[PDB]
Structure 1
């Protein structure tokens, strides 16, 4: 389906719905018949809207989720009406949708809530993925060296001055360790690195 930027393609059955009317006062809706999903947010990303009556009716809604899931060129987002009436049927739907099919699931209480949430999704979809806030080792090396038995804040920097990487420190003989620490601590360090 062709979805121009800043537009939502909606299934014709949504015409005159509160959902469509609330969206149409914020973003351009294009209506199209013969569509499996309820809305397309982009060419490849679509919405499958599961009503309170679908959820209470049984598992018939699953057939469509499977049909979209098995589409190579499409990513389905499931938006479900989770209300006082439907909520007992929600847990089995979430298991199937998210844990079985691996599809995104979003509950809403109402078409009014869905409208805000769908706009948020278009807004997310439209920005540069780099504006998604989710999309020097020396102080750490000191702390790592401090985990070696016998080695505190004073011996750690002395050890790293002479054996400058973990690998090199790991390979040091007792004789070489004895250039930096005493025999007891040289023995602790070496045992720490080499014991099974």
Structure 2
């Protein structure tokens, strides 16, 4: 017994509380924060920004996107075209946002009826997402 316990050389207990990040959405300073409290895994082939579960996903949006309106929706359609995934869409208010953010938010709802929780910066999200992930982990 004067020995020491193993150093988890293969903890098959990852399916517990883990978050996925698109290989591309890796070149972000945010994905780093997550590695400050929660575990993060990179997956090459995923479109979403952060995958919490197999039915829940999280996409980041910013005023810049609002300006488009026509084109970015297609990406959202690919999600609803799936099965029954209820993720969350984050929006970063800048300028033309709050101004025309309501017009889009209206349709997006009747269109996807998903969840939209605006923020203000990149931290709010990293803080809004993690703060949520830390709550789920718990029993």
TM-score of the two chains, using structure 2 as the length reference: 0.78
d(CA) in 2 for partners of 1:77, 1:114: 11
1:96 aligns with 2:127: no
Q: How many pairs does the alignment contain?
A: 128
Structure having the higher helix fraction is: 1
Corresponding residue SS for 1:78: strand
- Say which SS state the counterpart of residue 47 (structure 1) adopts: strand
Displacement, 1:112?
0.7
Compare CA radii of gyration and give the structure with the larger one: 1
Alpha-carbon RMSD? 2.6
Relative to structure 1, the CA distance from residue 99 to residue 73 in structure 2 (aligned partners, 3 Å threshold; closer, same or farther) is closer
Q: TM-score, normalized by length of structure 1?
A: 0.57
Q: In the aligned structure 1, how far is the partner of 2:75 from the partner of 2:134? A: 26
Q: Which runs of 5+ in 2 are unaligned?
A: 1-11
For residues 121 and 91 of structure 1, do their structure 2 counterparts lie closer, same or farther at Cα, with a shift above 3 Å needed? same
State the shift of 1:3 in Å.
7.2
Give the secondary-structure state (helix, strand or coil) at the position aligned to 1:108.
Answer: coil
1:139-177 deviations in whole A, cap 9, x for unaligned? xxxxxxxxxxxxxxxxxxxxxxxxxxxxxxxxxxxxxxx
